[PDB]
Design a protein around this ligand. Structure first.
Ligand SMILES: [Mg+2]
Ligand SMILES: [Mg+2]
Ligand SMILES: [Mg+2]
Length: 289
């Protein structure tokens, strides 16, 4: 059995300070992390565990790596994110009796686990006050047909509609604010549950279908950057053949290493930007994988 968990470096502005917590169970000082509840994805687990353990609300940004260790049940895998506090206040709780805010150097000395210190070294290495473009592959939508036109009207199937529902919370954990979808029904349907949650329109993007991408790949790159440049954190739902071409191109020009890679239906690429430069590309599994 692998137990899945998520954690964060919770930070706020002064130049940045980060939260270290004390737990009486081990008398230790560590970074907030906890286990995924039923039906949760790692990003939601992180944000919930942060608010439970520290009393702060926060929006996740860049991913900061993974920690794996044995436990009596088997293995625990923990993924960490940088998380900006959006407010709140600590008070002693069941799991955590104290919390200190520390500049990074001091936090480095406070943290007793080498693995947390590694995570914190990832954190300081790149900017953390980032905006976030969220590139999503549309959910499962059955079989491809014989008819020309790339099944423009083909809808999500039952699993795909569920992936769409599951994505709402996951994408909300990155402070998603505006919505974009390639001119295919399945792409829109994948983010319509989020649109409902945010009560917002989805902007249609004919330049980001597979057809348009192959016919004019430069138009798509140029449009991806326009969207990214707009204020807010855009969600862009597109197709399998478009995603690798765009992400790989952007990672190579920015010199960004993706720690994981994939391209499954319902998966998300979290693209973190600082001053309009890509500083991160984080591949997340479909919510039901
Ligand atoms: Mg906890
Ligand atoms: Mg915990
Ligand atoms: Mg917990």
């Amino acid at each position: 059995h692998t137990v899945r968990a998520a954690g964060a470096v919770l930070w706020r502005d002064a130049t940045v300070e980060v939260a270290v917590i004390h737990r009486p169970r081990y008398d230790d000082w560590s970074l907030p992390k906890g286990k995924l509840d039923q039906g949760e994805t790692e990003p939601v687990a992180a944000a919930r565990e942060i608010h439970e353990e520290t009393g702060h609300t926060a929006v996740l940004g860049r991913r900061l790596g993974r920690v794996t260790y044995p436990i009596p049940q088997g293995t625990k895998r923990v993924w960490y994110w940088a998380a900006k506090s959006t407010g709140g206040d600590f008070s002693p709780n069941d799991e955590v009796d104290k919390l200190v805010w520390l500049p990074v150097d001091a936090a480095m000395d406070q943290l007793q686990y080498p693995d947390d210190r590694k995570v914190l070294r990832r954190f300081v290495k790149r900017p953390v006050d980032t905006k976030t473009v969220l590139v999503v592959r549309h959910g499962t939508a059955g079989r491809r047909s014989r008819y020309k036109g790339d099944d423009r009207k083909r809808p999500l199937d039952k699993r795909g509609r569920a992936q769409a529902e599951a994505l709402v919370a996951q994408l909300m954990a990155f402070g998603a604010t505006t919505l974009y979808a390639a001119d295919r029904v399945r792409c829109h349907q994948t983010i319509e549950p989020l649109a409902q949650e945010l009560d917002q329109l989805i902007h249609n993007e004919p330049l980001l279908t597979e057809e348009a991408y192959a016919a004019d790949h430069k138009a798509a790159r140029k449009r991806l950057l326009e969207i990214a440049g707009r204020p807010g954190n855009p969600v862009i739902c597109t197709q399998g053949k478009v995603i690798p071409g765009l992400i790989e191109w952007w990672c190579e020009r920015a010199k960004v290493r993706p720690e994981t890679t994939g391209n499954r239906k319902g998966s998300t690429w979290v693209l973190s930007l600082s001053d309009g430069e890509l500083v991160g590309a984080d591949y997340l599994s479909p919510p039901d994988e």
